[PDB]
Amino acid sequence: HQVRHQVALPPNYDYTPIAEHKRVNEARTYPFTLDPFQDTAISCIDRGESVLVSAHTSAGKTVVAEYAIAQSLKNKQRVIYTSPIKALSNQKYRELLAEFGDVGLMTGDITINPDAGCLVMTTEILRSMLYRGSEVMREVAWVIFDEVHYMRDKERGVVWEETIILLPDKVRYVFLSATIPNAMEFAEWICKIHSQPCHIVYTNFRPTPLQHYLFPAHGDGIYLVVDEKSTFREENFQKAMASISNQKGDIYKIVKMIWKKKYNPVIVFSFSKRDCEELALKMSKLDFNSDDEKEALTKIFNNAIALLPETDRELPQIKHILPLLRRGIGIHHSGLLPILKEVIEILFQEGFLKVLFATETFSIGLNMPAKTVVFTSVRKWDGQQFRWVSGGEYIQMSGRAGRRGLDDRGIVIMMIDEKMEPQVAKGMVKGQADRLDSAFHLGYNMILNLMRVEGISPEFMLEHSFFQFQNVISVPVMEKKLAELKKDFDGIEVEDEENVKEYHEIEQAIKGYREDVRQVVTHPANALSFLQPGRLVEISVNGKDNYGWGAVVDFAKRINVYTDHESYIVNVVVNTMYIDSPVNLLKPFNPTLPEGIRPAEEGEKSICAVIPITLDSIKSIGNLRLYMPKDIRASGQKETVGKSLREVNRRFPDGIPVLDPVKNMKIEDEDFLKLMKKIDVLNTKLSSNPLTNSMRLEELYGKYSRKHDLHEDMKQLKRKISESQAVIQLDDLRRRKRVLRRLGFCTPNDIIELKGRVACEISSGDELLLTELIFNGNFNELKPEQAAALLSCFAFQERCKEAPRLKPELAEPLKAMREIAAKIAKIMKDSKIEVVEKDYVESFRHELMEVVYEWCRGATFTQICKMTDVYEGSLIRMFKRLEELVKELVDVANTIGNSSLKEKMEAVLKLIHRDIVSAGSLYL
Amino acid sequence: TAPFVVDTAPTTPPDKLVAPSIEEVNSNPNELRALRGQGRYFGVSDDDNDDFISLS
Ligand SMILES: [Cl-]
Numbered sequence: 001h002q003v004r005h006q007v008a009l010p011p012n013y014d015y016t017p018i019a020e021h022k023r024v025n026e027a028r029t030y031p032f033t034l035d036p037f038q039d040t041a042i043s044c045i046d047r048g049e050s051v052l053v054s055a056h057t058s059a060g061k062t063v064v065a066e067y068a069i070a071q072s073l074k075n076k077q078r079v080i081y082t083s084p085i086k087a088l089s090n091q092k093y094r095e096l097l098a099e100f101g102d103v104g105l106m107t108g109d110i111t112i113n114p115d116a117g118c119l120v121m122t123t124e125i126l127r128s129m130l131y132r133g134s135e136v137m138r139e140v141a142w143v144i145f146d147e148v149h150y151m152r153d154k155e156r157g158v159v160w161e162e163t164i165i166l167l168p169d170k171v172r173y174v175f176l177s178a179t180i181p182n183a184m185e186f187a188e189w190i191c192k193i194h195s196q197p198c199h200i201v202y203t204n205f206r207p208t209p210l211q212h213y214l215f216p217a218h219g220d221g222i223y224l225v226v227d228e229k230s231t232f233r234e235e236n237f238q239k240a241m242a243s244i245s246n247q248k249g250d251i252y253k254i255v256k257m258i259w260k261k262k263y264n265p266v267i268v269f270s271f272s273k274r275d276c277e278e279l280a281l282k283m284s285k286l287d288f289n290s291d292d293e294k295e296a297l298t299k300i301f302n303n304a305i306a307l308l309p310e311t312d313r314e315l316p317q318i319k320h321i322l323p324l325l326r327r328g329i330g331i332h333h334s335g336l337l338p339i340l341k342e343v344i345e346i347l348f349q350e351g352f353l354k355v356l357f358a359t360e361t362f363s364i365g366l367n368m369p370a371k372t373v374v375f376t377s378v379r380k381w382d383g384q385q386f387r388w389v390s391g392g393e394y395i396q397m398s399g400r401a402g403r404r405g406l407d408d409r410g411i412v413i414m415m416i417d418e419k420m421e422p423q424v425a426k427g428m429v430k431g432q433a434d435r436l437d438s439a440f441h442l443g444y445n446m447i448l449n450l451m452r453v454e455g456i457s458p459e460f461m462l463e464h465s466f467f468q469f470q471n472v473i474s475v476p477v478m479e480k481k482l483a484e485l486k487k488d489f490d491g492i493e494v495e496d497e498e499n500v501k502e503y504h505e506i507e508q509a510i511k512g513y514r515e516d517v518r519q520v521v522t523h524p525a526n527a528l529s530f531l532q533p534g535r536l537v538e539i540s541v542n543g544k545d546n547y548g549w550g551a552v553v554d555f556a557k558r559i560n561v562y563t564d565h566e567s568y569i570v571n572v573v574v575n576t577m578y579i580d581s582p583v584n585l586l587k588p589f590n591p592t593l594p595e596g597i598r599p600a601e602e603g604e605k606s607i608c609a610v611i612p613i614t615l616d617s618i619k620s621i622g623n624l625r626l627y628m629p630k631d632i633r634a635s636g637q638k639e640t641v642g643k644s645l646r647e648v649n650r651r652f653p654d655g656i657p658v659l660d661p662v663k664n665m666k667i668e669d670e671d672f673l674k675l676m677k678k679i680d681v682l683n684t685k686l687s688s689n690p691l692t693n694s695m696r697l698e699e700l701y702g703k704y705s706r707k708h709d710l711h712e713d714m715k716q717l718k719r720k721i722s723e724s725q726a727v728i729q730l731d732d733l734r735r736r737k738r739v740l741r742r743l744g745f746c747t748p749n750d751i752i753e754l755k756g757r758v759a760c761e762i763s764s765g766d767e768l769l770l771t772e773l774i775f776n777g778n779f780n781e782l783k784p785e786q787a788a789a790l791l792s793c794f795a796f797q798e799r800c801k802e803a804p805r806l807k808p809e810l811a812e813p814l815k816a817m818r819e820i821a822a823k824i825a826k827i828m829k830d831s832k833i834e835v836v837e838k839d840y841v842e843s844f845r846h847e848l849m850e851v852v853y854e855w856c857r858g859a860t861f862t863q864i865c866k867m868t869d870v871y872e873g874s875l876i877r878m879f880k881r882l883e884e885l886v887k888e889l890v891d892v893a894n895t896i897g898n899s900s901l902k903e904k905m906e907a908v909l910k911l912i913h914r915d916i917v918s919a920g921s922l923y924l
Numbered sequence: 925t926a927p928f929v930v931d932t933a934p935t936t937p938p939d940k941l942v943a944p945s946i947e948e949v950n951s952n953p954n955e956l957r958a959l960r961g962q963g964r965y966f967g968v969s970d971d972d973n974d975d976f977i978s979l980s
């Protein structure tokens with residue numbers, strides 16, 4: 001393919017062109033020829049210069065990270081590999097450890113070999129360690145950010161940004177990213193805030209090329225719409241979209257097809273745990289493994305299960321997954337037991353699972369691609385939102401198709417249904433990746449920590465923010481647009497009349513009433529009696545596409561409740577159809593015309609066709625009827641109608657005469673008549689306006705039109721500019737400070753209090769509410785299991801259908817805590833913060849208080865799974881977060897000498913951390 | 925004593941299904957299949973190039 005390089009340089013910097021660089025030695029060698037994009041980036045690293053690599057996942061970004069690790073270890077320096085989430089870290093830890101040996105891991109869940117030369121850690125742990133000011137950072141020469149484009153995430157994005165800003169200038173960075181369009185900005189931002197060069201290596205290289213296919217629901221096969229050469233097949237696409245417009249078990253057929261044509265392994269994506277298991281259920285009748293394979297994976301499986309006690313081994317979640325696995329069918333989502341999630345990944349890599357039903361998260365797992373990828377849908381819940389999966393997302397996921405060694409191509413199949421709009425579908429498969437736009441936002445833990453530390457400030461963080469940086473770049477571009485508009489406006493501000501204003505007003509009023517008339521006469525109650533064969537009708541479908549005058553062939557009651565206008569289909573002959581429109585896709589009673597169907601424009605040839613429309617598409621009904629052919633489908637008959645239309649238009653150059661709605665159609669109710677009279681009043685009033693006759697007309701009119709648009713663009717542009725100002729964020733800051741002052745976390749002089757200091761060290765739950773809780777004493781008299789239960793209200797982030805009827809020993813602490821939250825949400829409102837006070841209080845989810853409480857009192861796993869609808873894996877996830885939170889509290893208690901609190905929190909840890917909840921990971 | 929209370933007060937209806945309590949649940953793992961396996965893999969079974977590629 002092609003490799004693009006750029007570099008962002010500090011002022012007055014002595015730059016030697018990267019391509020001239022010759023490394024004296026290779027800090028790491030590879031058993032394959034480097035790709036130039038790799039070679040280049042590695043030179044950057046050899047030169048001690050930061051670099052953003054921007055490439056697709058199969059392209060080999062890992063080669064670059066590895067080089068930085070080796071070079072650091074070689075120079076006796078330390079290096080940090082930051083992953084987005086803990087699951088990837090574990091995977092990456094396992095991969096790096098085997099390679100370089102001198103490797104450790106620090107996540108929310110665990111710490112291994114913390115003194116190693118190469119540390120794998122999550123962005124969150126990095127963040128803490130920085131604010132914690134750990135000495136580790138001093139020794140660090142390189143920080144690698146894997147998947148840095150996650151910085152654009154609305155809720156988690158801030159952490160990336162925050163930690164980057166926080167890093168020492170001496171440090172150098174390897175940023176790994178998807179192919180983003182605005183790499184330059186990122187580099188430049190790095191360049192400014194860290195006063196060092198930052199390279200950019202970009203490439204669209206794909207080792208294995210993708211073919212994109214559409215599968216219309218209930219269809220008979222798949223349609224190639226984008227081929228290996230990346231060529232868009234318009235014609236096939238049109239066919240596909242029409243096939244669904246004319247029209248859960250399809251999946252079974254699709255997998256069977258894939259099997260039959262040897263396209264496995266396939267990842268079948270869905271966007272809900274539930275959809276995943278359902279789909280797997282349909283497959284199980286099939287069997288994709290040889291007896292040898294069955295034996296092999298059963299051994300692997302048992303070996304994983306071996307650490308677990310028999311009592312856990314007997315969970316039906318464990319016992320009844322094995323029969324799926326043996327058939328070569330996998331499942332993967334955050335709801336499974338972790339141990340199952342892991343071994344399934346493993347069994348997938350070893351090629352024992354030919355079909356894998358998975359949620360989105362599997363797509364960013366380490367080294368787990370397939371030959372084929374199937375989207376069962378492209379709609380995902382953002383909890384409380386309905387996303388058409390972004391182009392960028394479609395790409396990244398579809399990028400998991402095509403296995404470098406073994407496949408000529410990757411196969412991507414997008415299942416579509418009636419809900420699908422063509423533009424959206426077209427948009428995905430021609431996926432253009434999204435910008436990396438900052439999602440920075442102020443946070444209390446952030447602010448508080450900045451205040452705590454001598455040399456830095458909230459104001460600093462804002463100033464160095466990618467967010468603010470993206471502003472100071474964009475604003476001048478916009479002020480340049482505004483001025484260009486303003487100049488055109490002030491220059492176009494040559495209105496000769498205010499009579500024009502009157503003209504406009506009248507015209508539009510008339511236009512509006514005529515539409516009212518239209519609604520009436522085209523209503524089936526009026527129109528159907530006048531739509532006899534041959535009737536001349538003026539056509540305008542969706543009010544956009546004007547086919548001019550056509551002729552009715554027939555009409556009929558629409559058969560699937562629609563609106564009245566939409567309840568009848570009329571077939572009409574038009575002679576203005578664009579010559580290349582796919583008229584072969586038209587179906588006789590589907591008013592949703594195929595993509596491509598359009599009128600011809602100024603310099604195009606026309607053809608005659610029979611299209612189906614609803615009464616909405618009728619603009620006028622004429623008082624003429626063509627003599628229609630007996631068989632409109634017989635050769636030349638359409639063109640014959642067309643000739644007659646030409647003759648009619650030629651015999652009526654100034655418009656085809658229409659049915660008088662009153663004198664002909666007999667529509668004479670009172671309201672319709674005064675409607676016609678209003679139209680009548682305005683037409684004469686119009687004639688009185690001097691302009692209507694004159695020659696100026698369009699000159700004076702178009703002028704009038706232009707200023708207002710221009711005025712609008714300006715008004716709109718002035719706003720975007722207004723909301724791109726640093727002061728916004730600065731307001732947010734002062735407000736949030738009020739809060740911290742009002743709550744007693746910091747002085748009015750913005751000096752941190754004892755309460756601020758403890759809140760600093762809390763990252764797992766809401767640091768305000770938790771802090772308040774602690775200092776008011778709510779934990780003082782609780783037994784540990786109560787504290788556990790109360791604390792679950794911060795670790796639990798999931799949504800569920802069942803909820804417990806709390807006895808008092810849980811209901812009271814819950815109540816007491818909601819009161820404080822309330823007091824807090826008060827103060828939040830008090831400081832003009834965009835917070836809905838009830839939603840806050842309720843954001844602390846309580847539905848697992850009894851689960852946690854009883855787990856802490858010795859209930860078995862089985863029992864607590866029965867006490868809630870939350871998934872087993874989710875349960876363990878929640879416990880693990882709960883542990884992390886608790887450890888953070890143990891820490892703060894320690895550092896304020898509250899020996900009683902500390903012991904309590906420690907006791908909680910001992911209650912939680914046992915049995916299946918304490919099962920270790922297959923990777924560690 | 926009296927096996928009832930007098931109560932003429934209202935209680936806000938629960939937003940969600942009432943979950944089972946510790947008292948209602950035993951440690952028999954096979955029971956999960958019915959109680960929690962609905963529509964899940966461990967639920968109980970009924971037992972108790974070319975432009976176009978066809979499914980064919
Ligand atoms: Cl995570």
Ligand SMILES: [Cl-]
Pocket residue numbers: 326
């Ligand atoms: Cl079997």
